[PDB]
Every structure is written in C-alpha cells, then in structure tokens.
Symmetry: D2
C-alpha cells in the first residue's frame, strides 16, 4: 500500500492535498504554519511535525512550496527532507523553482537513497481544486510511474520531459509568456479606458478574434471590477519572471520583453499588491 506525504498547504497545495484525501489515499501533511493543516486533518489527513517525519514515513511525498528559497530550506534545513528520505522513498517537488535548484535537490535526495521527480504545474487555483492541472514532470521514471494514480487525482494531463531541469525550464518558459500576456492585456485595457473605450466591448472584440483565450476572459473581468481575489499571487508571478530572466542570462538568451514585464510586476509589488492576484499588475499600469 503506497502512502502519501504532502508539504506546503498554500493556495495550490491545500486543494491538491485535499484531492488526494478525497481520492482515498492515506495522506500525511505538513505546513510551516501548522494552522493550515486543520482542514486537511478534518478531511482525514494525518498531521506531521516536520518534513523529515513525513519523508521517513511516506512512500511518496509531494511538495508545493513558494519559491527556490522555500524549496531549499525544506530540503536542506533542520528536520528537512534529507533527514528522513531514503530506502527508495520518493520526493516529488511540484514547486515552481529554477532548474539549478531542482537539480541540486534531486542530487541530494538521490544521494540519500531516495527517488526524485520535479513536477511543476500549469494551472491556477480553480484547476488545483478541480484536479485539472497540467503536470510537467522530469526525473526518475519509476517514480513518475508509481505516482500515476495520484497524478490522476491532481491533473488532467501529465508529461514526462526527460532529465531533471527540463520540467522547471518548461514551466518557466510557459509562465514567462503568461506574465507578458498579462501586462499586454493590462496595458491594453489601461490605454482603452484613457481612450474612452468601453472595457467590456474591448474584451468582447478580443474574444471574437484570433487572440481569444480563457485567461483574457477571466482576468478581464477583474480589470473591469477593480477586484483581484487571489488565484495566482502577484509575488509568485514576479518570482517566475525573475527566474525566467536569470535562466535567459545563464543560456545567453536576451529577453527584452520579459525583463520589461518583470520590472512592471516589481512596481506592483512595491505599490502593495504582492498578495493580490497577478492580474493586479493592472493597478500600476492604469493611473
């Protein structure tokens, strides 16, 4: 009987962990702030005291953490993953991080006798809740296979992209496009309002043509309402652009558009919108 661990019960991790419990897996959870475990425990998960405790006890442990710093602290820190993982047990880090971080975590886990897979996802809060994430995995093939039933509870589509690092790279490339699309939509709507245009009509014109997409439809309504309930935290969008630009630096790939969008998201953080939805970059694009 395969048992599951889950570290990081945030906006994404909460719903993802809940999906595993509801699918009927034996799930052990941990979160830095213990209060976030409560709803998962009430659903039937067991609470653990540290990442080390989870990885010592569970056949497959999944992590869904904020950023490279969080991922590294949970792996390498006191009572962290490396103090418990071993004996073939698996660690699947689904956090969005850079390829150097995922590679380092994987090498460490492997050296302790664990198996490692990175599996960042495309899809926001609602997809996490619904189990319709796109999973971008890379690393240990036997672990990818073993986690199949769990991935089916979490996502609608699962790819294995090769060696550790390719998953992170795919995720960063996809989100770099997304960040620039959001600033494009935001600048368009800001200019539109200054033009006296009806924002609803602008969205209707976009939805009838070749650019029509669900993100424009959904985020567009936030722009009209001026309300930005958080699906994907603006601070994490800015983190992903930061990471894309750093990746471009390492590969010798110039990214004028991404760099510009990165700085606009930094402006939005500076102006106090870090914890709002990433669509809230609009608040520093419109006057």
């Amino acid at each position: 009987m395969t048992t599951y661990g889950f570290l990081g019960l945030g906006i994404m991790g909460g719903p993802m962990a809940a999906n595993l419990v509801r699918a009927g897996f034996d799930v052990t959870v941990w979160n830095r702030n213990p209060a976030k475990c409560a709803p998962l425990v009430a659903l039937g998960a067991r609470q653990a005291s540290s990442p080390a405790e989870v990885c010592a006890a569970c056949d497959i442990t999944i992590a869904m953490l904020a950023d490279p710093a969080a991922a590294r602290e949970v792996c390498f820190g006191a009572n962290g993953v490396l103090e418990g993982i071993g004996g073939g047990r698996g660690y699947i880090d689904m956090s969005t991080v850079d390829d150097e971080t995922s590679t380092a975590i994987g090498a460490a886990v492997t050296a302790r006798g664990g198996r490692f897979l990175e599996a960042p996802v495309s899809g926001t809060k609602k997809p996490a809740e619904d189990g319709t994430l796109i999973i971008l995995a890379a690393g240990d093939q036997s672990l990818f296979t073993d986690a199949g039933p769990a991935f089916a509870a979490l996502g609608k589509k699962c790819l294995h992209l090769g060696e550790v690092g390719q998953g992170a790279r795919m995720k960063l490339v996809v989100n770099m496009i997304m960040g620039q699309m959001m600033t494009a939509l935001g600048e368009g709507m800001a200019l539109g309002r200054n033009c006296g245009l009806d924002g609803g009509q602008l969205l209707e014109v976009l939805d009838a043509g070749a650019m029509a997409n669900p993100m424009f439809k959904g985020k567009g309504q936030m722009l009209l309402s001026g309300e930005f309930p958080t699906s994907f935290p603006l601070k994490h969008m800015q983190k992903d652009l930061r990471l894309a630009v750093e990746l471009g630096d390492r590969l010798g790939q110039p990214l004028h558009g991404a760099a510009t969008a990165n700085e606009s998201f930094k402006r939005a953080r500076a102006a106090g919108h870090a914890d709002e939805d990433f669509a809230a970059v609009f608040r520093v694009l419109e006057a």
Copy 2:
C-alpha cells in the same frame, strides 16, 4: 447601391472580391493598376483615380497601408476630396491614428460627403472568408447604409461612436497582439535554447488558460522557420508605433508596447519587413 474600392492589397483584394461575388456593383482603383486586373475579371469596373471613384459611387471603401497613404488618397491630387459630395459616403477601413481619421472625416464632411472609419480585426484568411470584425465609428446613416456590404466582409460589426473611437479600439487590440507575438517569440526562443521540444511547448500552451488560435497558427511558423505573409511585419510595427503615439497623447505610459515596438524595429532593420509579423522571432532567437 453602387460601391467603390480603393487599395487592392493583401486585405483589400479579398475584400473587394467578396463584394463582387456577393453581387454588388463595384468600381475599383489601386495606385498600381496591375492589381486591378483580377477584380476586373471577377466583374468589377476599373477607374483612373480615387476622385473618379468617389464622384460616381454611392459608397466608397478604402483599405490602405498607413496614415501617410490614407492622407495622400484623401487630400492628394485626383483624391477623394475632389470627387466626394452630394451625400456620397467614404468608409476608410485602413488602420490609422485617430487624428488622421478625424481629419479625413472633417474634410469629407465639409465637401458634402458622409464619412465613417471602420478598421478591422482579422488577417488575410478572415478577409478572404468574410469573417472580419469591423470596428466602425462615425456617420450613423452611412453605417446603416453599409450594412449589406459589411455583412459580406465581416462576421461582426460594431458602431463605437464618434470618429476616432474605431481607430482607438483597433490600435488597442493590435497593441495587445504585437506584445503577444513578442511574448510567444521570446518564449519559443528561450525554450529551444533550453533544449525543449517546440511542439511540446505549443501543446502545453494549447492545453491551458492561454490557449488561442494565434499561438497555434504562428507557433507553426516558428517551428518551420517560414513566415509567409498574412499581416506584414512592417504594418505591425506601424501599429505599435501608432499605439505608443496614442499613449503619448493620452498620457498613458506603455513600457511593454514600447519595448515590443523596438523589437519589431530590430526585425525591420534585419530585413524582415515584408514577411509575416511572426518573423520578429528571427531577431529574438539567437
């Protein structure tokens, strides 16, 4: 009842052809007369100048490259203003700035003509298919009179108010499109540098919230490295230029648009002006 058509380019050719096939009485003109031949063969008449067309046709449509071209056809010798009058209509469907369309409308109106701007969203194929989105602004009665023709050209028609509003909507829409293209281009460039399969990148994009026909279509050009022209790169650069100028007038900062504009200028300088606008990829990837 009678229609005229000025500018038989990538967009104007198919548009005029739709009006002829739909049975409208169409008189065409183009700066380069050779472009008229195919439409004459379909059943259009041919005229020697815009003034000649606007003097004889109840409603004249223009589909020209840029504000300079629009202004030259309107204000130039043997131009629109020398023929328009008597309530006859001029519908400029060229993508231009609001100052240009406003100026053209004022002059047309002063001459006793009716003016409507009606730039479109949709590229070569939609123009061929008659599935354009028409963004009209200006004279209400002319918009009404143009209904049957618009139905042959487009799948959707809006009247956005006073002259200028159509030009603003179009520039806003194309500004988003220009930034989406550089975004896809930068992503594919980084992805290929990362050793990722470009096809898989497109597949992930098509499975998620950003999925759209443009990424699907232009994505395949990025993979093949062939950029057959639907929307010329130079015209996209022109549109970004106009959007930045509009932002300037309205006091709207546009860091993203401005950066995309300069990347499209790099692509023009690198010799890709006449390729599809997706060829901006050629200056984004190493």
Copy 3:
C-alpha cells in the same frame, strides 16, 4: 541696421530676448500670452500683436517655442510668420522640433521670400540667462552670418551643421542621451536610498570617477532636497524623447533604451510632474 524680433517668451525665450535687449539690439517681442511681454518691455523691448506683425517689420526674427505643434502653429497659422515674412528677412527657429517640421517651415519661409535658419540649443535655464548656450544651427549661411552678433549675446558656442534638419537631429541625439542619463541617475539614487546608502556619498563617489559631470552634480542636489524648480520642463524632456524615438523609427534605428526612458517620463507626466524640472522623473522611479 539690423532690427530683431522674438517670438515665445517662455523659460528659455524670456532670458534670451532679455539678453538681446541688454546687448543693445532693437527688439520687438510677442508671446501667445501677452502678460509675459511685460518684463521685456520694461527692459526696453517693443511689443507686437502677432508673429506676422513682427516678421513684417524686423530684419531677423527668432522663435523659442514649446514643440512642433507650437512651431507649426506660429508659422502656418492665422497672423503667423508666413503672413509677414518676405523681402529676404530672416526667421531663426530655435525651438526643439523634429527635422520634418523644421524642413517644412524652412521651405514655406523660403517660398515667401524669407531666409530660414534652424538653431536649437543645448543648455538649460541658467545658460539661457547667462548667454552660455550651445547653438546648433543649420540652414541659410548668410542668415547664420548675419545673426552672429545676436548669437554672441545668446551663446558661448555656435556651430553650423549643414542643411536644415541636421541641427534638429543633433539636438534630438544630444537630448536622447541626456534623458537616459537622468533616468540612470534617478534609478541609481532610488536603489541607493533603498539600500540604506547615503545619497550625498553616492554623489561624491560619482563625482570622483569617470562619470563625473555637472548635470549629476546639479540634479543630484534636487534628488536629495526633494524640490524640482524648473530649469527644463519635464514635459519637454518627454517630448524630446518622443521625437528621438520617432526619428529612430524613420531611420530604421532601434532604440530600446530611449524607448524605456520615454515611457518613464510619460509616467512622471501622468503623475502630475509635467511642469516641474525633468529631474522630477525621480518621483516615479523612487518608492
């Protein structure tokens, strides 16, 4: 006996016209808002009702106007320059405009039997007051020569750069560099203060090294004081960057840096700093 006209008594024009009056020239002034003529008349200038009136009666008329729209309006508008210029009388437009504007004005002036010279300047309010401008002239060589004594009252350095358009291009190139230097200084000081560094020390380090220049010294003090009394209006710097980017468009010259600076200056305008010194772009660079 050469008589002089002067159109546009703004931040630059007022002190420039005043230098001509103090040097002993017979000067006739006009300004759209006639109230700005009072101080010049008090110094000994005469006042006219229109540009046409000035250009019909004066041997050489100088204009120092805001922008291409102003220059074209004063030239081509009702009771404008073309209604009065003729008989070999000279028109010297010292406004900062694009090359297509100065070329068009020059052609129209010449068609009326006038002589035209464009002569934009490098140097701000204090140099205008002190008569230490750098004059970047292009156009009619006889008019350049005839204006020698007036130019000596206005500037410390005078160049003839060839055909009309060449002076405008030199001025726009020079100011494009200046605009980018101002955002560079502004961003540096903003980052520095965020780092807990002493701004005075930052300025001291810059002044001791290879970048040391009078602009950094002078504008640096504004940044420290938080007051931006106007030497060069922010709106006019933004206008100059706009024209440089449009010039680059025409010449097929990409300008990522200028384009970015242009947009930052637009932000500063939108935030209400249009009529402060251009160093006030700092107000939107700093948090």
Copy 4:
C-alpha cells in the same frame, strides 16, 4: 605587515604590482599559475593555494571575476577558510552581490579571521595608477590595518558600514555606468544614421552639462570601432544582472537597468563578451 593577493586578472595584476613596488611583502596566487610570473619578477613570492596564502599572511586581498569565483576561492578545497584564522584578515575586492560578501564574511569570522569587503570604482588605468576609489565595509580594525595598502591602491577610500554596504554602493554606481554606456551607444548609433559627424557629437557633449571622462574615452572607441579591453563586457553584464537582482530583493523596480542588462546580453550573444564593455555599441548600431 605581510600581504597576500589572490586573483591576478586585468585589475588584480596591476593592483598586486602596486603593492610590490611600494615595498610590501607580497605573496600571490592565481588559479592559472602563469599569471604569477610577472609579479614574481617584480619581487612577489608565489603560493600554491588560497589556503597557503591565508595561513601565512597578515592581510590577504582577493580580486576575482564574480560571485561564483569569490565563493569557490573562499569555500572550496584548499580555499581561504582552510587557512584563515588567528585574527588574520581577508579583504575581498571583487565585485559581487551583498549576499555573497555577507556569507563569505560570516564564514571567515567563524574561522577566527577578520573580513572586509572593498570593491572598487575605476578601471584598468586607475588600477595601474593607484587611483582607484575604494568602497569598503566590514571589520573596522581591518580597515585601519589595511590603510597603508589602500593608500598604494587608491586615491580615495570610504568605510560604508556593515558588510554588504560596499557591494551595494558598487552595484549602484556600476548600474548607472552601464546605462550611460547604452545611452552613449544609442546616441552615437542614431547620430551616425542621421548623417552627423560622430566627432562633432562628442564635441557638443563635451561642451555641455553632460561632459565627462567616460564619454570622451569610450566615444573614441565608438569612432574607431576598436574596443581594447579595460572593463570586460561580460563583467559589465554581470554587474547589471546583480543590480537587477538587488532591486528585486529591495522591491525597487528598475526599467532602465533591466533594458540595459538585456542589451548587454545581446552583445555577449554576438561574441563580444571579452571586449571592452563599450562594445555593446556593436549591437546597438546597424
């Protein structure tokens, strides 16, 4: 009394040599041992590893490429930490981020050594001439002890407080420098395209409020098309990278620096990494 010097590059070589000529007892090391030969000929001693240098010298200076290099020399096998102790000092003059210098400082101090960061403003010639501006931060007793050496290396030395403050000041200063270089380069590129004389442009600049030694010196490279290396283009790009990352940590947006950073990356991609940083011009002009 006794000194060590690690890293004999474009800057390190001339700096070590100034210390030898001033009569200091200097022991040098460089990853590539051949670089030591000229210093040894001047009267320096040579060591086999950073550990060896730091175990034997009262004060050791490092002048290394980047944070990667600085960390490897500190934390790696036979590195600084395996030798430093007993109150002996380590002065890292490399241009790195404040996180790197803080981490190095913390490790050195835990080993019983003293740490000072002291990055410098000034390029190859100032290094040769001993006219660097030294931007130190960290242990005060070490700053005082290093006074005589700093006097032979520089014309001005500041103590800016806790470790990290020197790195921040250096990155701020070089961020400005990087943007000035792209500004000058874009201006000269546009000017040449305008048919203006590049020499006259430089002359107009030198007569006005922007006049500075950097424009005068780099301007001549732009005219000649030769970029002999004073400050490697790859290190300028590294410095802008670090400024952008520092801005990220402090929540300070930097549109100008970010744009300049990407232009320098283009110049690296175009093959100019080892030329003078003024060679960014080669990707700004057409």
